[PDB]
Design a protein around this nucleic acid. Structure first.
Ligand SMILES: [Zn+2]
Lengths: 90, 227, 42, 293, 179, 55, 35, 76, 147, 97, 206
RNA sequence: AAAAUAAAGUAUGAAUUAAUAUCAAAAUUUUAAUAAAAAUUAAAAAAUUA
RNA sequence: UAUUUAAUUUUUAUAAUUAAUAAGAAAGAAGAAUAUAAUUUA
C-alpha cells in the first residue's frame, strides 16, 4: 500500500460522487420542464505562432448528444461505391 | 506412417499416445504383445495410456484383415508374436466386420484402479461378437474358473460350436497345466515370490494345486455340457 | 503508456510525456497568463 | 521530430495569434477586451479601448481580402467554419474493428513474380452486441462486437443470460472497441468485411503460442466479401482456429491512416446496397484486391 | 495466532475497506460533527496540521489514543493554497519504489500539476503519521475524514459544515526541514 | 532448511488450494442403476450391461 | 492469458466455410492471370 | 450440525463434465448408440438445472425444443 | 468451353430415416414422383442417396447438414428453428429437354402438394410419399453462380 | 474435386475439366485408379462388378452408386462417379483428334 | 414470395411466438419482445428457477417504455417478492472462490438481471419520458419502494456472504484490473437524483 | 538445437539442517570491522513451481 | 532452505478513471486420441 494508490483508492469514488453532483444540475433543469444540452462556446482562436516562429494548431472537438442519440438508434445511409470498389492507395 | 499398422507414438494429435516404456523399441514390443493377446482372447483389460493405443492398433489389424491381401497378411505376420493368430484374424474378422466401416474396437474405462499404482484400467473389446465364429456367446463379466478353462458362455447360448482348429490349439496349450511339473512350478513360484517378498503369498506347504483329476472330470463334464 | 481511447491526431499526448493519465484537474501550475491567473490583474 | 512544435499557454494572446484574436463578451465577439460596467472597478494605468485604428484596420483588410479572393483563402475558411459532428472528422474519429478467425494459410503472387505468404481470416457473423458508455464520461465509449452464431447450449448458463438480455443472437465470443460518439452503430447491426478497405493497415490482437500479442502495422492484401475472408501478407504465430481482434491502425509516425490523399473509410460501418444479393454472386467476381506494394 | 496470516489485500478481489462505512469496536460515528475549512490564502502545511488535528480527534477533551473518533473536515479551495516564497519550486517530495531505479524526486509544482488535492493529502498523511505510525489502522482510518475539493463546489451541503474559524498564530512562513 | 519451523509454518500449507484439493475433498456420486453400487460418472463396471449401456 | 476471448477457439465450426473450395478458387485466379 | 453431505450436484454445471458433451464417442458404444448422448436439448451444456428452453434465447439458425416440466426424480 | 454433365436439380427430397432403409424404397419412390408431376413413367431420375451427418454441434447451412423444418423467410419472428426434418437427401432430375422454367415449375408444384401432404398428417401420390414411405422434407436448390 | 464437402459444384467441375489437359495421355478406357478419391478399397469393389473403365463408371445408373457406397461401403463413391460423368465426353472428343 | 423449402408442422403450444424481429431484418437482427406483462409475471412465479427468472426480467426490461402505469405496478409488485426488508438486498451468490487466501464470492446471473431492469427503468422514466413520474404518484412510490427493497445504495451487501466480513467488491478497483466488472456502477443514481429533483422545487412561485 | 530417458502422481519414507517471536520485503544515514543493529522514511497478501 | 524475482492457482461475455515496469459450480485423456467435434456403422 503505497501513498498514491491509497489516495486514489479513497478518492476515485469521491470524484465519481462529485461529478454526479455536477450531473444533477441538468436534472433540475430537466424536471422543471426545460430540456437543453448545456452548450459550449466555440473557440475562435486556435491558430498560433510560437517564439520559434512556426505554426501551431489547437484541435477542439465538440460532441453532440443529439447526434449521438440518433447514431445509436438507427442505421447509416448506404455506403458509397467510391469507397469500397476502389482501393485505398499507399 | 499413414500406413494402417506402423505406428508413431507422440503426444501431439497427429500421433497415438506414447505410453511409458523403456525405449521406442520396448514400446513397440509391448504394443505387439497387447495386440497378440487381444487377438487371442477378444477383450484386453489394460492400464494407462496403453488403452487408447491398443484400441487404435486393434482397428488397424481389423482393417488389414479386411484388405485380405498377401502383403497385408505378411505385414501382420511381421507384427505378431503368434503366427496362428494372423490366421485367426483373417479367418474371423472379415465376416465379423463386413457391415461396418470405422471403430471396430470398443474401449471402456473401468471404475476400479490397479492397487499397485493409481493407474486407471480400461476394458478393450472387439465390437459386435455375435457375428464372431469362435467368440460367439461368451460372457466376460466375470472370468472363468482356472484361466486354462474355456471362458464362460451366456445361458441362452450354451450349445454353440467353435472352429475345430482353434480348440485344438487351445486344448494343446491347456494340457500342460494338468501335468505335475506345473504344480512344482506353482509351489516354487510361491517360494520365489516369498523370498523377494511380496506380502500375502502363502507358504508353499499351503498352496494346494490349481488342477486335480476330480475337478477335471467335472470340468470336462460341463465343458461337453456347453460343447 | 497509451491506453483507453487514443485519438488519431499524431501526437497530442507527447509533451506531458505520452500518457492520458490524469486530466481531471480544472487547476494547473501557471505563469502569468496561464489558467487560474484568469482572476489576477496584469 | 517525434515531438510537435511546443507552445506555452502564456504565449497565446493577441500578438501571437495567427488569425485575428477575438475577445468573448458572451453574447458577442469583438476585438476589444470587455470594458467592465462598473467603472469604479477599472484599474489605474489601464486603457479601456472602445476603438482602435490599428487592430480594427488590419481586421478590415483581412475580411474583405477573404471575400474577394475566396480561392486563395479557402484554407482560412477553417477558422470561421468548423465541421459539424458526425461526418467523420479525420483527426477526431475512431471506428470499431471486428472479430476474426485464423482459418488457413495461403500463397499469392502480385503483378510481378513474387511469392507472398498469406494468412486468411474469417469473420463468420459480426454483430454489434453491446453499447457501453462509462458514467457518461467523454471518450469512454465502447462498442462490443460478437462473433460466430452458436447453439443455445454452448456457454455456461451465465453467458447465455447476457445474450438473452441483449437481444442479439448468442455468440461464441465478444470484444470491445473504444470509439468516438459518432462511430456508434445501433445494437444488432450485421457487420461486413468491407468495413475494411483493401489498401489499409490493421492492428491485430490475438493469442500467441501463450499470451496475447499485438501486430500494429500489418497491411491488408485481399478481401472476399462472399466467403467473408480477409488476407494478410504475414505468418502469424498462432493456432488455426484462434479468434483475432481486428482494428484500424490509426496512425503511422505522424501520418493519419485516413485522409484525402490516401482515402476515406466507410465511416460508422460498411452498409450493403439493398439491391445486391450475395446468393446470386460467385466467389471470383466477389474479390477486392489492393494496389501494388 | 490472534491476527491472521491470510489478509485482506490490494490485489485480492474482496478489496480494501473504507473506514467510514466500517463498523469496528474502536470506530465511533456517533459524536461527530462536520467542519468547513477554507484553505484560500492559507499555508499548505499549516492547513494540513489543523485539519489533521480535527480529523484525528485530538481536539476533543475526551480523546483517547486507542479510540478513533474524528470529525469530518471538508477542505475547500485547495487550489488557492499558498506556499510561501520560493517553496513551490524548491520543496521536494521523494519516494522509493522497491525495484531497480528506486528514486523519485518530484517538485511540489509537479504533484500540483497532476492533482492539487494530492498535495493536501500528502501533508495530511504526514501530520497524522507524526503520532500514528506503528499500527496501520491508526494511520489509514483518520485520513478518510478529510474531504478535499480543489474549489468551492462540494456535495456535502446536507451536512451543513460549520465554518471552522481558525487564524494561524504562527508569524513566520513555513520552513522545510527533512534530514 | 536453515531453520526449524514452528506450528504456524506447518499450518500455512493447508490454506493452499493445492493441499485442499489433493487431500480434503468430497466426490460426487450416484447409485449405478444396474449395480446399485456407488459410482462416479464416466467410470464403469466390467459387466455385459455396464459395457453396453454405460449408466 | 486466461480470458475467454483468447482461450476459446472456432475449430469445431470450420465446416461452415469451404477452405478447400476457396483455395482452388484462387488457384484458378492464379492460372487465369498466369502466375 | 446437520450432516455435512452435499445435495445432488449431478445436474448443475460442471466444467469437466461439460467437455464430454460435444466429444465423439462412437468407439465407446456397441449396440446402443444414441445421436448425441451427453447433450440434453435446450439445457445449458448438459446440465438439467440450467434449462433454457421456451424462454426467449434468440438462436436464428439453430433448433430449439419446447418446454415440458421436468419430473422430481430428474433433479433431486 | 461448354459445361458438361452437371445437371440442374428439380427438387431435393429429404427423409428422417437413414440411407439404408431408403435404398429398398427407391424403386417405389420414382413411381410416386412420376404421378406427383403427373408425367409418364421414366420421366424422373433420382440421383444418388446422400446421408447427411450426425451433428453433435450442428453447424447450419453446411452442404452436409441435417435440414430443419423451420426456415427464416417462412417464420420471421420465431426465435429459433423447428428441429431436424431430414437426415437424408435424394435429388430429382427430369428430362434434359426442359429448360430452366419448366424444372422450376415442376419444383413449385412438388413443394405445393408435399406441404399439404405434411399438413394432412394433422390413394393420391402425396401422402403415399409421406405416410407409408417416409419423406418429411422437400426443397428447391439454389442455382449455382459458379459458372 | 478431392476435399469437396457434400454436393459437387460446377466451379469444381471446372477444376476437373482444367486438369484434364494437365495430363496429356488419357483414353476413355483408362484404368479406374486415376480418378479423384479412388482408393484401393473403392477400386476393388468396382472391379468385382466388372468395371475397369472410365466409360463404364460414367455408365453407372446412380442406384448402383448408392448401394456401392452404402450396402457395399465405398465412401466418396459419388465423387468418383461424378468426376467420371464430367470427364467422359471431352475424352472422346480428344480421342477423335 | 414462395417457400424455398417445405415447413414441417407443429401444434399450437410449441410455436416460437411471443417475439418480433426489428423493422429492418437484413441489417439489424435484434429481437424485440411482444409478450404481455401478465404472462411474464406468470413465467416469473410459475417457473421459479434462475434462468426463467432471468429471461422474464430481460424481457420486461426490454418492454418498459411501452407499458402503462398500473402494468408497471403489478410488474414491480411481482418482482419484489423475494426480498427481506431485513436481508441484504440483491445478493444471489453461487460459487465460493477459495483461490486466494480469504474466500471470494461470485453472484449469479440474477444480479446483472435486476440491475439491467433498474437501468432500463432509468432510461425510460428519466431520459425519454420525463413527465411520467410526476403524473402518477402511485408508481413513483412503487419504484421508490422497490428501489429501497433491494438496497441499491449499498451494492456492497450484494457481494457480502457474511455480515462479519463485509465485502468491498462494489467500492474497490485497482489499476491492474481487479473488480473491473463489479466496479462502480451508477445504479440508482439518475433515478434517485431525478426523482429528488421532482420534490426539489422549493420556489414559492410554484 | 531434433531422437531416446527422467518431473502433478497411489504406497513406502530416510539424510544434511534447526537460538528464536505468525516475520524480517525497499531505501537513506550513523554506529569500534558485511551490519538481517540502531534511527528515519517506507510499503512487503496466501499457495505452488523454477 | 530464508529472501528475491519469473511463472502458475486449471474459459475472465468485457478488461485499463490510478499503482508498478485478475478470475462462475471442476478434475480422468487437453485427444475417446490414427489432427473431420461423430465420415455411413451390428
Ligand atoms: Zn455398474
Amino acid at each position: 500500500d503505497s501513498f498514491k494508490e491509497h489516495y486514489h483508492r479513497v478518492h476515485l469514488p469521491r470524484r465519481l460522487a462529485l461529478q454526479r453532483y455536477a450531473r444533477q444540475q441538468s436534472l433540475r433543469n430537466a424536471a422543471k420542464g426545460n430540456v437543453k444540452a448545456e452548450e459550449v462556446p466555440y473557440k475562435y482562436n486556435r491558430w498560433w505562432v510560437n517564439e520559434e516562429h512556426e505554426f501551431v494548431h489547437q484541435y477542439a472537438f465538440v460532441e453532440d448528444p443529439e447526434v449521438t442519440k440518433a447514431k445509436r438508434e438507427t442505421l447509416p445511409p448506404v455506403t458509397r461505391e467510391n469507397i469500397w470498389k476502389e482501393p485505398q492507395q499507399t | 506412417t499413414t500406413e494402417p499398422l506402423m505406428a508413431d507414438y507422440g503426444w501431439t494429435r497427429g500421433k497415438l499416445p506414447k505410453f511409458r516404456a523403456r525405449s521406442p523399441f520396448h514400446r513397440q514390443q509391448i504394443a505387439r504383445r497387447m495386440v497378440t493377446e487381444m487377438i487371442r482372447k477378444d477383450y484386453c483389460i489394460v492400464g494407462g495410456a496403453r488403452a487408447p493405443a491398443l484400441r487404435i492398433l486393434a482397428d488397424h489389424v481389423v482393417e488389414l484383415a479386411k484388405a485380405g491381401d498377401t502383403d497385408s497378411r505378411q505385414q501382420l505376420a511381421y507384427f505378431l508374436h503368434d503366427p496362428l493368430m494372423v490366421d485367426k484374424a483373417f479367418d474371423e474378422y472379415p465376416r465379423r466386420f463386413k457391415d461396418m466401416n470405422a471403430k471396430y474396437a470398443m474401449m471402456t474405462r473401468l471404475k476400479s484402479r490397479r492397487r499397485t499404482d493409481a493407474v486407471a484400467m480400461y476394458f478393450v473389446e472387439y465390437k459386435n461378437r455375435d457375428m464372431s465364429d469362435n467368440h460367439k456367446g461368451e460372457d466376460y463379466s466375470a472370468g472363468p474358473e482356472r484361466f486354462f478353462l474355456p471362458p464362460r458362455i451366456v445361458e441362452t447360448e450354451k450349445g454353440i460350436q467353435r472352429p475345430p482348429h482353434m480348440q485344438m490349439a487351445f486344448d494343446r496349450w491347456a494340457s500342460k497345466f494338468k501335468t505335475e511339473e506345473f504344480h512344482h512350478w506353482w509351489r516354487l513360484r510361491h517360494a520365489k515370490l516369498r523370498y523377494w517378498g511380496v506380502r500375502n503369498v502363502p507358504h508353499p506347504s499351503d498352496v494346494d494345486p490349481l488342477w486335480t483329476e476330480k475337478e477335471e472330470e467335472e470340468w470336462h463334464n460341463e465343458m461337453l455340457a456347453n460343447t | 503508456n497509451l491506453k483507453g481511447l487514443v485519438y488519431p491526431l499524431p501526437y497530442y499526448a507527447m509533451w506531458r510525456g505520452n500518457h492520458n493519465k490524469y486530466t481531471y484537474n480544472k487547476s494547473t501550475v501557471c505563469l502569468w497568463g496561464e489558467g487560474d491567473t484568469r482572476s489576477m490583474y496584469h | 521530430r517525434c515531438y510537435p512544435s511546443l507552445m506555452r499557454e502564456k504565449d497565446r494572446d493577441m500578438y501571437h495569434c495567427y488569425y485575428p484574436y477575438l475577445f468573448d463578451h458572451g453574447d458577442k465577439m469583438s476585438l476589444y477586451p470587455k470594458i467592465p460596467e462598473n467603472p469604479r472597478e477599472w484599474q489605474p494605468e489601464q486603457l479601456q479601448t472602445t476603438y482602435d485604428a490599428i487592430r480594427e484596420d488590419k481586421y478590415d483588410a483581412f475580411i474583405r481580402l477573404r471575400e474577394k479572393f475566396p480561392e486563395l483563402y479557402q484554407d482560412t475558411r477553417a477558422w470561421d467554419n468548423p465541421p459539424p459532428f458526425g461526418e467523420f472528422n479525420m483527426f477526431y474519429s475512431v471506428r470499431f474493428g471486428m472479430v476474426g478467425v485464423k482459418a488457413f494459410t495461403c500463397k499469392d503472387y502480385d503483378e510481378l513474380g513474387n511469392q507472398f505468404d498469406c494468412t486468411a481470416f474469417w469473420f463468420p457473423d459480426n454483430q454489434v452486441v453491446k453499447h457501453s458508455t462509462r458514467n457518461g464520461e467523454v471518450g469512454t465509449d465502447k462498442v462490443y462486437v460478437g462473433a460466430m452464431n452458436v447453439p443455445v447450449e454452448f456457454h455456461k448458463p451465465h453467458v447465455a443470460a447476457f445474450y438473452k438480455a441483449a437481444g442479439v443472437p448468442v455468440k461464441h465470443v465478444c470484444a470491445g472497441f473504444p470509439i468516438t460518439p459518432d462511430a456508434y452503430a445501433p445494437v444488432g447491426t450485421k457487420l461486413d468485411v468491407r468495413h475494411f478497405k483493401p489498401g489499409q493497415e490493421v492492428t491485430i490482437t490475438f493469442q500467441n503460442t501463450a499470451a496475447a500479442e499485438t501486430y500494429q502495422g500489418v497491411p491488408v492484401w485481399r478481401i472476399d466479401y462472399k466467403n467473408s475472408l480477409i488476407y494478410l501478407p504475414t505468418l502469424l504465430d498462432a493456432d488455426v482456429g484462434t479468434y483475432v481482434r481486428f482494428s484500424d491502425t490509426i496512425n503511422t509516425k505522424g501520418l493519419t491512416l485516413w485522409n484525402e490523399h490516401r482515402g476515406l473509410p466507410a465511416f460508422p460501418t460498411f452498409i450493403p446496397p439493398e439491391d445486391e444479393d450475395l446468393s446470386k454472386l460467385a466467389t471470383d467476381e466477389c474479390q477486392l484486391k489492393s494496389p501494388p506494394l | 495466532p490472534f491476527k491472521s496470516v491470510l489478509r485482506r489485500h490490494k490485489h485480492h478481489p474482496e478489496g480494501l475497506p473504507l473506514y467510514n462505512d466500517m463498523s469496528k469496536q474502536w470506530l465511533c460515528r456517533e459524536g461527530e460533527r462536520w467542519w468547513l475549512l477554507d484553505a484560500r490564502g492559507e499555508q499548505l502545511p499549516r492547513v494540513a496540521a489543523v485539519a489533521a488535528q480535527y480529523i484525528t480527534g485530538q481536539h476533543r477533551p475526551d480523546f483517547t489514543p486507542g479510540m478513533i473518533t474524528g470529525d469530518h473536515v471538508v477542505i475547500v479551495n485547495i487550489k488557492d493554497v499558498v506556499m510561501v516564497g520560493d517553496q513551490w519550486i524548491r520543496v521536494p517530495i521523494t519516494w522509493q519504489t522497491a525495484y531497480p531505479g528506486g528514486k523519485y524526486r518530484i517538485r511540489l509544482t509537479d504533484m500540483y500539476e497532476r492533482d492539487p488535492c494530492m498535495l493536501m493529502w500528502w501533508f495530511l498523511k504526514d501530520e497524522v503519521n507524526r503520532h500514528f505510525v506503528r499500527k496501520l489502522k491508526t494511520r489509514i482510518a483518520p485520513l478518510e475524514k478529510a474531504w478535499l475539493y480543489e474549489d468551492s463546489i462540494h456535495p456535502h451541503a446536507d451536512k451543513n459544515p460549520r465554518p471552522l474559524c481558525w487564524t494561524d498564530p504562527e508569524v513566520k512562513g513555513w520552513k522545510y526541514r527533512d534530514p | 532448511p536453515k531453520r526449524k519451523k514452528n506450528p504456524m509454518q506447518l499450518r500455512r500449507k493447508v490454506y493452499g488450494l493445492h493441499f485442499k484439493e489433493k487431500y480434503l475433498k468430497m466426490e460426487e456420486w450416484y447409485y449405478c442403476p444396474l449395480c446399485a453400487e456407488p459410482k462416479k460418472p464416466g467410470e464403469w463396471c466390467r459387466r455385459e450391461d455396464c459395457r453396453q449401456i454405460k449408466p | 492469458t486466461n480470458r475467454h476471448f483468447f482461450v476459446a477457439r472456432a475449430n469445431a465450426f470450420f465446416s461452415r466455410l469451404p477452405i478447400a473450395r476457396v483455395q482452388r478458387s484462387l488457384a484458378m485466379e492464379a492460372v487465369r492471370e498466369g502466375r | 450440525t446437520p450432516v455435512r453431505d452435499r445435495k445432488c450436484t449431478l445436474q448443475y454445471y460442471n466444467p469437466i463434465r461439460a467437455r464430454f458433451v460435444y466429444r465423439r464417442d462412437k468407439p465407446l458404444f456397441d449396440k446402443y448408440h444414441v445421436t448425441a448422448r451427453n447433450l440434453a436439448p435446450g439445457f445449458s451444456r448438459g446440465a438439467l438445472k440450467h434449462d433454457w428452453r421456451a424462454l426467449g434465447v434468440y438462436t436464428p439458425d439453430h433448433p430449439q425444443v419446447p418446454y415440458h416440466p421436468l419430473q422430481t426424480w430428474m433433479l433431486g | 468451353s461448354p459445361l458438361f454433365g452437371a445437371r440442374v436439380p428439380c427438387c431435393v427430397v429429404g427423409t428422417l430415416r437413414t440411407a439404408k432403409e431408403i435404398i429398398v424404397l427407391k424403386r417405389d419412390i420414382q413411381s410416386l414422383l412420376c404421378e406427383l408431376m403427373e408425367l409418364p413413367q421414366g420421366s424422373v431420375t433420382l440421383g444418388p442417396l446422400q446421408q447427411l451427418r450426425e451433428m453433435m454441434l450442428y453447424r447450419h447451412g453446411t452442404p452436409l447438414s441435417p435440414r430443419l423444418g423451420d426456415e427464416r423467410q417462412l417464420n420471421m419472428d420465431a426465435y429459433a428453428r423447428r428441429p431436424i426434418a431430414a437426415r437424408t437427401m435424394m435429388d430429382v432430375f427430369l428430362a434434359e429437354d426442359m429448360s430452366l422454367d419448366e424444372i422450376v415449375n415442376f419444383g413449385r408444384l412438388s413443394l405445393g402438394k408435399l406441404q399439404i401432404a405434411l399438413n394432412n398428417l394433422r390413394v393420391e401420390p402425396a401422402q403415399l410419399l409421406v405416410d407409408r414411405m417416409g419423406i418429411s422434407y422437400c426443397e428447391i436448390p439454389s442455382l449455382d453462380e459458379s459458372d | 474435386g478431392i476435399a469437396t464437402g457434400g454436393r459437387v459444384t460446377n466451379e469444381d467441375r471446372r477444376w476437373w475439366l482444367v486438369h484434364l489437359e494437365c495430363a496429356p495421355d488419357i483414353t476413355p478406357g483408362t484404368f479406374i485408379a486415376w480418378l479423384d478419391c479412388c482408393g484401393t478399397h473403392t477400386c476393388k469393389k468396382l472391379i468385382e462388378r466388372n468395371i475397369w473403365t472410365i466409360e463404364q463408371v460414367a455408365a453407372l445408373d446412380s442406384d448402383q452408386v448408392d448401394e456401392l457406397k452404402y450396402r457395399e461401403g465405398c465412401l466418396k463413391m459419388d465423387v468418383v462417379w461424378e468426376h467420371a460423368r464430367t470427364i467422359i465426353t471431352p475424352l472422346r472428343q480428344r480421342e477423335v483428334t | 414470395r414462395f417457400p424455398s423449402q417445405t415447413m414441417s408442422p407443429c401444434s399450437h403450444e410449441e410455436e416460437m411466438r411471443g417475439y418480433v424481429v426489428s423493422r429492418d431484418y437484413p441489417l439489424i437482427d435484434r429481437l424485440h419482445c411482444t409478450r404481455s406483462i401478465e404472462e411474464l409475471v406468470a413465467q416469473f412465479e410459475d417457473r421459479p428457477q434462475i434462468e426463467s427468472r432471468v429471461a422474464a426480467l430481460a424481457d420486461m426490461a426490454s418492454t418498459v417504455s411501452f407499458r402503462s402505469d398500473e402494468e408497471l405496478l403489478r410488474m414491480f409488485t411481482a418482482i419484489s417478492a423475494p426480498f427481506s426488508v431485513d436481508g441484504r438486498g440483491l445478493n444471489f451468490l453461487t460459487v465460493k472462490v477459495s483461490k486466494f487466501g480469504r474466500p471470494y464470492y461470485v453472484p449469479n446471473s440474477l444480479l446483472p438481471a435486476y440491475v439491467n431492469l433498474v437501468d432500463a427503468t432509468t432510461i425510460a422514466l428519466v431520459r425519454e419520458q420525463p413527465w411520467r413520474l410526476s403524473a402518477s404518484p402511485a408508481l413513483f412510490i412503487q419504484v421508490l419502494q422497490f428501489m429501497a427493497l433491494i438496497k441499491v445504495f449499498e451494492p456492497n451487501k450484494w457481494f457480502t456472504f457474511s455480515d462479519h466480513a463485509p465485502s468491498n467488491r462494489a467500492d474497490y478497483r485497482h489499476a491492474i484490473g481487479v473488480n473491473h466488472s463489479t466496479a462502480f456502477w451508477g445504479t440508482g443514481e439518475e433515478l434517485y437524483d431525478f426523482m429528488v429533483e421532482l420534490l426539489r422545487v422549493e420556489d414559492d412561485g410554484r
